[PDB]
């Protein structure tokens, strides 16, 4: 723990890095490239408390931003002449090799 010589990967990902064996292993905290920005500083997300502005400006509803910017007529779709749908589908498959962020169940 860790074995001094190994031939294959562990399932959990443990021992891939000898000096810090938990790095890249499953069921561990994400690394941060920037300090987190929360409403209360440590826990509450932005848009949690009504009236509380982010950086001096009111927080926009995620659905409202989706309505005004993301939304477009379906029959107006532009097909990619240089990419296949496999280009999209490999992306998801690869994403599911890298990360899954768990959520509590009900209740």
């Amino acid at each position: 723990t860790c074995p001094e010589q190994d031939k294959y990967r562990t399932i959990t990902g443990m021992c891939n890095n000898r000096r810090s064996p938990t790095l890249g292993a499953s069921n561990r905290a994400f690394v941060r490239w920037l300090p987190a920005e929360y409403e209360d500083g440590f826990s509450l997300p932005y848009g949690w408390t009504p009236g509380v502005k982010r950086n001096g400006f009111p927080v926009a509803l995620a659905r409202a931003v989706s309505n005004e910017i993301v939304r477009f007529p379906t029959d107006q779709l532009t097909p990619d002449q240089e990419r296949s749908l496999m280009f999209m589908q490999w992306g998801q498959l690869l994403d599911h090799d890298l990360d899954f962020t768990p959520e509590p169940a009900a209740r």
Partner: protein
């Protein structure tokens, strides 16, 4: 609580509120369900809240084999000494293997077709059944492991169940790395960002942090802009397979029955190869099939994926657009005019300023996908930076990277370099005509297609232990 059925904002629920004059949800008292991603340090006053990664960060095919030992042990065929993965015991795709069914309490896959009675599949990742296109990819990799374990048994009859499994796992894991870093990523980042963030591989660096960044989980959601509103299926002659060639995406989510009953993985894979993806345009970001009708069949109401992405970034406490621009060494626009110059779109810059008030407040996914794409790439400068920085850490910080000294022999690497996704399809399906390399670029039939006979299979001669 439930966050799935209630609109009250109490932990761990953070539901999306409904704006006035919403095109779909007329009721303002209603809301979009959202569970907060559970913290790594529950109910702490001291630590800043951070989220958990349930999987191995490494490109090690953990979506096939699993990231936890109890799950990984259940996915294997434990009956014999062949080192195979467990296959479906009730159904088969024209004689070929399928993923085994999952024993879940509240199975969403049953809700898609009530008379079908086809539950969700069991794989290394829990989301395997989310869409039949993803299921087809999971099934293909399962067959590849079994095919490799069979051929390794011929080369080495002395090898037991454990040895055969691990050796085949090592190859499939290497296969995903090669297709990702040689075929996939260069087409995401473009040639310019590919050279910047992923230069020629040297060797393993034990000082490189291989962990997944919190921002990457939201940033790599760029592919939601590539999603087509339909699932496309074609017959062996690459023609619209009847009577459902163009099925709306809102009716394919968790529809595991469409794989088992309506043909198999062959028509779905032929569709992904011969159908163009959606192009990310500034006024055409994401289709309404995922923006209005996400999981419409298995939930009380249809979800808004792009909005769920933006809500999640706030849940994860991720900084705004400009903070990540500064992180990457990219200019940070202050005014609407400056944002217009960065986006090459003043009209879009106005709409973003109407919502956010400042480029500092723009959600990472929103500002990321809004940027004009890099030449021969499918992401803007910002997303290319985050995605590029991440994948190098996964490469250089991986001791079991396929190119690393001691992982494979010289002839093993030389044989592994010959692998391709079209060839994996040839070896594991009934499809005889597949896409030309690059597979992610080839999208038109019959212009971009060749026969399997012209494509050589993986040579496992160097795996012989004489």
């Amino acid at each position: 609580v439930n966050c799935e059925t209630s609109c009250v904002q109490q932990p761990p629920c953070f539901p999306l509120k409904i704006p006035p004059n919403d095109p779909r949800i007329k009721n303002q008292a209603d809301c979009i369900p959202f569970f907060r991603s559970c913290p790594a340090c529950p109910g702490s006053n001291i630590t800043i809240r951070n989220q958990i990664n349930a999987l191995t960060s490494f490109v090690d095919a953990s979506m096939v084999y699993g990231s936890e030992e109890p799950l990984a042990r259940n996915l294997r065929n434990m009956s014999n000494q062949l080192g195979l993965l467990a296959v479906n015991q009730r159904f088969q795709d024209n004689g070929r293997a399928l993923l085994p069914f999952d024993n879940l309490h509240d199975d969403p896959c049953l809700l898609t077709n009530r008379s079908a009675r086809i539950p969700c599949f069991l794989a290394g990742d829990t989301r395997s059944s989310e869409m039949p296109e993803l299921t087809s990819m999971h099934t293909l990799l399962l067959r590849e492991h079994n095919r490799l374990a069979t051929e390794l048994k011929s080369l080495n009859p002395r090898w037991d169940g454990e040895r055969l499994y691990q050796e085949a796992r090592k190859i499939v894991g290497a296969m995903v790395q090669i297709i990702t870093y040689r075929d996939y990523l260069p087409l995401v980042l473009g040639p310019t960002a590919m050279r910047k963030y992923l230069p020629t591989y040297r060797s393993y660096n034990d000082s490189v942090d291989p962990r997944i960044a919190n921002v990457f989980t939201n940033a790599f959601r760029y592919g939601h802009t590539l999603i087509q509103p339909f699932m496309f299926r074609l017959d062996n002659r690459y023609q619209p397979m009847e009577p459902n060639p163009r099925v709306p995406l809102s009716r394919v989510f968790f529809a595991s029955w469409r794989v088992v009953l309506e043909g198999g993985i062959d028509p779905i894979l032929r569709g992904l190869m011969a159908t163009p993806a959606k192009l990310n345009r500034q006024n055409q970001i994401a289709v309404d099939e995922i923006r209005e009708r996400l999981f419409e069949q298995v939930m009380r109401i249809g979800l808004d994926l792009p909005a769920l992405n933006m809500q999640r970034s706030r849940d994860h406490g991720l900084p705004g657009y400009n903070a990540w621009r500064r992180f990457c060494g990219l200019p940070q626009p202050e005014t609407v005019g400056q944002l217009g110059t960065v986006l090459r779109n003043l009209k879009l810059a106005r709409k973003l300023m109407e919502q956010y008030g400042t480029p500092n407040n723009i959600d990472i996914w929103m500002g990321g996908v809004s940027e004009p794409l890099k030449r021969k790439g499918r992401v803007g400068p910002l997303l290319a930076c985050i995605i590029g920085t991440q994948f190098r850490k996964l490469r250089d910080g991986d001791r079991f990277w396929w190119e690393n000294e001691g992982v494979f022999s010289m002839q093993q690497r030389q044989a592994l370099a010959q692998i391709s996704l079209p060839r994996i399809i040839c070896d594991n399906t009934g499809i005889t005509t597949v896409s030309k390399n690059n597979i992610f670029m080839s999208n038109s039939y019959p212009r971009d297609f060749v026969n399997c006979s012209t494509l050589p299979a993986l040579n496992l001669a160097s795996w012989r232990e004489a």
